[PDB]
């Protein structure tokens, strides 16, 4: 609404820059740290999961031996015998702007639960869940953390950009404007003042008289 | 005649006399009085006052005041960072202070010249107010460190008692102050 | 300037003195978060602070706007309390306990 | 600016040179942390550097305070040393190994 | 010389003035005769032109026009937030407004004045395209309120038709007026 | 300021006057885009852009550069048409229909 005025503000608005400039100088080397920690997450993710899937599936198709429809039977006859639903722990961790939850959902989930021996492939197959369920949890909880912290990483560098080359070259651009006008003020000062002298001397040159 | 303290007739006062108070402009537009910037201001006289204060007032007063400036002039330390990325992502020893101090100027730095009472104080009264807050800082510091959070602490009823606080007069003052002296230690340990 | 003279003391309702500085200071407090909001996010404010910003638009819009339609000292005041109404009690330190509840 | 022709190995104490460019560059490194700790907590500082925070506290509290105590060039260099011991060794790589092998 | 409102000659033609019609450098780069800046104006007779207005132009003119200023007013206010986030993470129904506004410029700015279509344009021709667009808003307003995506209105050719709005020789103006009025409430009623 | 004379038929060639604005209007929509890479994403863009992107490069180092070899007004427009070529022909509002097939 108003163009910033013409004096006072030079010093204040320069210290606008001092704060800003130093603030945004350093906000990067704030952020450098988090980029490090992104790497920590990055290695870890798929490792076992990919592994223990593969002998899981071994039995998955193998257990059809004549179990082509006793999968059905076994799930009927045996299931809901080790916890199969609920165990979400919503987690808070560093989240910027308007908040965000992450979480791990872990609760019991795989072993034997059938009464006695009963078919063999059953037991073996359910044993794969041990190796599955559990493993599927690690990637469920690392891969989501990874992408969230990704956004942040980006979002931070976003501000970095704006601040680094939107604010600074502009509020700079104001400051000059102060300078030249603060200065122009005084050219006229002198020039005006000059003329006063001229008067004093011209005037008293005829207070010499004669 | 401006606002530019750079102007000669003003400046010439400084560096001819001591004890400079500056009265900020953008402070006052809001509504306080006789609010000053204490991040402009500065007195010199302040060391050779120590004798009289010790004896007359309290024997431990100047220490108890410097810790107030301890927060107060340091608080800008955070202020700037607030305007660089919000109060967001300033965590908890963080937002402790901010708020403590928030109250420190909301209640220890604004009197009136029109409120019927409370517009004049003795030291010993004022002195009092000031000891409370320190306490509140102290115990809060040990609140978060222990395992709970300011978040609710703000929204304790006991904060507001520290709030309105200045208004009662002297007569009541001793005992007013004594009542909070009980109320503190219980109202921390409980929650 | 001349205002602490002729106000409230059988000259306006006793609520006046404390009205003004509160309502005043709220708005001050108000637009302030108009800025902090526009930098950090679109909001990230707490549900305490939400109530503040909600009153911003309000204050300006209802109350300070006015038709040719004149007002009276009393009808004004009414409205006045109505914008203090929206903030929840225990946030108005600038008003004292009686007056606040007197016409809440 | 001119201070090279100051303190010297054969003029007034030998190691001073390097003390000077130690505590300086060491210092500034820590004054950042003291601010950025405000944004991420302290649970994200590595070990070496976490110590570079504490350095600052002992530097500021004791080292540049000096009340009415007078000191001397020799007593003063010692103090310095001591404080530098607080952070991890084999790192202060501006200073040469010899000296550290005689003071710590 | 500054191109800045600052020198006296701009301040002094401002107290013996009626209205103002400030231009602006910045727009001049992206070429829009006249570089009239619809944030940099003020008449001082649109409180006393209404009689001849709602008598000759229409009667749907002193209102319907102004309700377009509200559009373009708000186009500003959102732009900030757009560049603060993107033209993305908005509420969906908003992203309407951004290219409604777009059209208030595509067909209500420019007009070279060097192409034998500009060089006198009546209120009728004006009001004409002003009102079409008004509609368009409300129509889409219902479309997405129901739940269709805001995207969907954008590809519709009825906008393309309106982009030639200022390319109809004067006489045959009621030819597209009513015609396309129906093509608007018509074709867009498919969805 | 001029460029409305010394244009078109009977003087120049019928197409300055046309292709004038086109390129103008082309370049513009480039620069807008080049902002939005830098503040939201590199595939958070339409592909209606990927052509204007590459058109901006062509207009960039392909066209603007001209070395210390010469060009001639013909040759200019000639390669001016090449400049357009990349864009689909449904976007080029500012051009009379006849020329559109007279060149490509």
Burial class (CB in 10 A: 0-12, 13-18, 19+), C76: exposed
3-state secondary structure at position E87: coil
Give the Cα separation of B28 and B34 in Å (integer). 8
Provide CB contacts within 8 A for A100, sequence distance 6+.
Answer: A148
CB–CB of C44 and B30 under 8 A? no
| CA nearest to A124, candidates A109, A137, A112 | A112
F10: left (phi over 0), alpha (psi -120 to 50) or beta: left
Provide CB contacts within 8 A for E61, sequence distance 6+.
Answer: E53, E54, E123, E127
Smallest CA–CA distance, residue E4 to chain A, in Å, is 9
Give the Cα separation of A203 and E100 in Å (integer). 72
Give the Cα separation of C86 and F11 in Å (integer). 73
CA angle B129, B133, B139 (to 5 degrees): 145
Backbone angles phi, psi at B116, to 5 degrees: -55, -40
What are the CA-CA distances from residue D73 to residues B97, D64, D69, D84 (Å)? 40, 14, 13, 17
Concatenate the DSSP letters of all residues of E119-159 into one string: SS--HHHHHHHHHHHHHHHHHHHHHHHHT--GGGGTS-THH
Strands E20-21 and E41-42: antiparallel
| CA nearest to E128, candidates E163, E95, E174, E159 | E174
Q: How many CB atoms lie within 10 A of CB A117?
A: 9
The answer to whether residues B138 and B100 touch, using CB atoms and an 8 Å cutoff, is no
Number of folded domains in chain A?
1
C–D touching, 3+ CB–CB pairs within 8 Å: no
| CA nearest to B84, candidates A162, A146, D85 | A162
- Torsion sign (Cα): E134, E137, E143, E146: negative
F–B touching, 3+ CB–CB pairs within 8 Å: no
What are the CA-CA distances from residue D9 to residues D13, D21, E12 (Å)? 6, 16, 73
Give the Cα separation of A51 and E6 in Å (integer). 73
DSSP state of D88: P
3-state secondary structure at position D90: coil
Give the Cα separation of E173 and E168 in Å (integer). 7
CB–CB of D36 and A94 under 8 A? no
**Is the backbone peptide bond immediately before B34 cis, with ω within 30 degrees of 0?**
yes
Chosen for mutation from E27, E31, E114 (greatest number of chain F CBs closer than 10 Å) is E31
DSSP state of F58: I
Chosen for mutation from B87, B149, B167 (greatest number of chain C CBs closer than 10 Å) is B87
Backbone angles phi, psi at A104, to 5 degrees: -135, 140
Q: What residues of chain E lie within 8 A of the CB of A3, using their CB?
A: 4-6
Give the Cα separation of A62 and A53 in Å (integer). 14
**Is the backbone peptide bond immediately before E34 cis, with ω within 30 degrees of 0?**
yes
Calculate helix-pair angle for E123-146, E66-84, nearest 10 degrees.
50
Concatenate the DSSP letters of all residues of A101-123 into one string: -EEEE-----S--SSSS--HHHH
Q: How many CB atoms lie within 10 A of CB A24?
A: 19
DSSP state of B4: -
| CA nearest to B108, candidates B140, B144, B64 | B64
Chosen for mutation from B7, B37, B84, B88 (greatest number of chain A CBs closer than 10 Å) is B84
* Partners of B17 in the β-ladder: B14
Experimental method: cryo-EM
* Neighboring chains of A (3 or more beta-carbon pairs < 8 A): B, C, D, E, F
* Partners of A105 in the β-ladder: A88
3-state secondary structure at position B172: coil
The answer to whether residues E161 and E91 touch, using CB atoms and an 8 Å cutoff, is no
Provide CB contacts within 8 A for D27, sequence distance 6+.
Answer: D55, D56, D59
User: What is the number of CB-based contacts under 8 A between chain B and chain C?
Assistant: 32
3-state secondary structure at position F22: helix
Give the Cα separation of A58 and B163 in Å (integer). 71
Resolution in A: 4.7
D100: left (phi over 0), alpha (psi -120 to 50) or beta: alpha
Give the Cα separation of A7 and E65 in Å (integer). 43
Q: Which residue range forms the structural domain that includes residue A205?
A: 1-210
Give the Cα separation of F37 and C20 in Å (integer). 50
Strands A102-105 and E20-21: unpaired
The answer to whether residues A8 and A182 touch, using CB atoms and an 8 Å cutoff, is no
Give the Cα separation of A183 and A7 in Å (integer). 10
Smallest CA–CA distance, residue C12 to chain A, in Å, is 36
| CA nearest to B157, candidates B176, B181, B184, B189 | B184
Give the Cα separation of B147 and B170 in Å (integer). 38
CA angle A196, A201, A204 (to 5 degrees): 120
Give the Cα separation of E61 and E40 in Å (integer). 23
What are the CA-CA distances from residue C11 to residues A95, C3, C6, C77 (Å)? 54, 11, 6, 14
Smallest CA–CA distance, residue D85 to chain A, in Å, is 25
Calculate helix-pair angle for D22-40, B76-85, nearest 10 degrees.
60
Side-chain half-sphere of A45: how many Cα atoms within 13 Å?
Answer: 14
| CA nearest to B56, candidates B8, B111, B127, B1 | B127
Concatenate the DSSP letters of all residues of E31-59 into one string: --SS---SSSEE-S-TTSSHHHHHHHT-S
DSSP state of F13: -
Q: After which residues is chain F broken (C to N over 2.5 A)?
A: none
b/e string for E129-161 if b means 16 or more Cβ within 10 A? bbbbbbebbeebbebbeeeeebeebeebebbeb
- Describe chain B by its helix, strand, coil percentages, rounded to 5: 60, 0, 40
Give the Cα separation of A4 and A178 in Å (integer). 9
Q: What residues of chain A lie within 8 A of the CB of F39, using their CB?
A: 158, 161-162
Provide CB contacts within 8 A for E124, sequence distance 6+.
Answer: E57, E173
Concatenate the DSSP letters of all residues of A157-206 into one string: HHHHHHIIIIIHHHHHHHHHHHHHHHHHHHHHHHHHHHHHHHHHHHHHTT
The answer to whether residues B129 and B166 touch, using CB atoms and an 8 Å cutoff, is yes
Alpha-carbon dihedral B28, B32, B38, B44, rounded to 10 degrees: 100
User: Counting every residue, how long is chain E?
Assistant: 191
The answer to whether residues B152 and C48 touch, using CB atoms and an 8 Å cutoff, is no
Give the Cα separation of B175 and B116 in Å (integer). 22
């Amino acid at each position: 609404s108003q163009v910033s005025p013409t004096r006072m503000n030079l010093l204040q608005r320069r210290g606008q820059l001092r704060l800003a400039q130093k603030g945004v100088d350093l906000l990067k080397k704030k952020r450098d740290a988090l980029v490090a920690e992104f790497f920590g997450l990055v290695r870890e993710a798929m490792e076992a999961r990919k592994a223990l899937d593969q002998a899981a599936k071994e039995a998955y198709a193998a257990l059809l031996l004549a179990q082509a429809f006793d999968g059905p039977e076994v799930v009927a006859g045996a299931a809901l015998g080790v916890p199969p639903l609920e165990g979400v722990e919503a987690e808070v961790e560093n989240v910027w702007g308007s908040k965000v939850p992450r979480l791990k959902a872990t609760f019991p989930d795989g072993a034997l639960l059938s009464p006695v021996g009963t078919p063999a492939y059953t037991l073996e197959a359910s044993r794969a869940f041990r190796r599955y369920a559990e493993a599927l949890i690690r990637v469920a909880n690392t891969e989501t953390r990874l992408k969230k912290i990704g956004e942040e990483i980006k979002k931070t560098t976003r501000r970095v950009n704006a601040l680094e080359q939107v604010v600074i070259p502009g509020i700079r651009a104001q400051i000059r404007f102060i300078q030249q006008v603060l200065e122009q003020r005084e050219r006229e000062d002198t020039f005006r003042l000059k003329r006063i002298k001229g008067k004093i001397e011209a005037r008293e040159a005829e207070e010499e008289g004669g | 005649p401006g606002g530019d303290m750079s102007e000669p007739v003003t400046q010439s006062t400084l560096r001819i006399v001591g004890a400079f108070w500056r009265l900020d402009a953008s402070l006052a537009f809001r509504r306080h009085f006789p609010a000053i910037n204490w991040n402009g201001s500065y007195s010199l006289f302040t060391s050779a006052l120590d004798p009289w204060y010790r004896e007359n007032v309290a024997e431990d007063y100047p220490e108890l005041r410097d810790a107030i400036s301890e927060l107060l002039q340091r608080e800008a330390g955070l202020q700037e960072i607030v305007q660089l990325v919000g109060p967001d992502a300033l965590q908890d020893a963080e937002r402790l202070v901010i708020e403590v101090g928030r109250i420190i100027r909301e209640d220890f730095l604004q009197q009136n010249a029109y409120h019927e009472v409370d517009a004049y104080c003795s030291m010993k009264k004022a002195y009092g107010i000031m000891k409370m807050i320190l306490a509140f800082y102290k115990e809060a510091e040990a609140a978060i460190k222990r395992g709970v959070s300011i978040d609710e602490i703000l929204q304790l009823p006991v904060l507001e008692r520290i709030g309105r606080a200045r208004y009662v007069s002297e007569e009541e003052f001793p005992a007013y102050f004594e009542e909070a002296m009980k109320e503190i230690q219980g109202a921390f340990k409980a929650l | 300037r001349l205002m602490n003279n002729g106000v409230g003391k059988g000259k306006t309702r006793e609520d006046h003195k404390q009205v003004s500085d509160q309502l005043y200071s709220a708005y001050a407090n108000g637009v302030d978060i108009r800025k902090l909001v526009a930098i950090i996010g679109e909001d990230a404010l707490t549900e305490n602070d939400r109530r503040y910003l909600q009153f911003a638009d309000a204050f300006e819009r209802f109350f300070i706007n006015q038709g040719q339609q004149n007002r009276s000292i009393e009808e004004s005041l009414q409205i006045a309390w109505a914008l203090l109404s929206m903030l929840p009690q225990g946030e108005l330190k600038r008003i004292s306990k009686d007056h606040i509840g007197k016409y809440y």
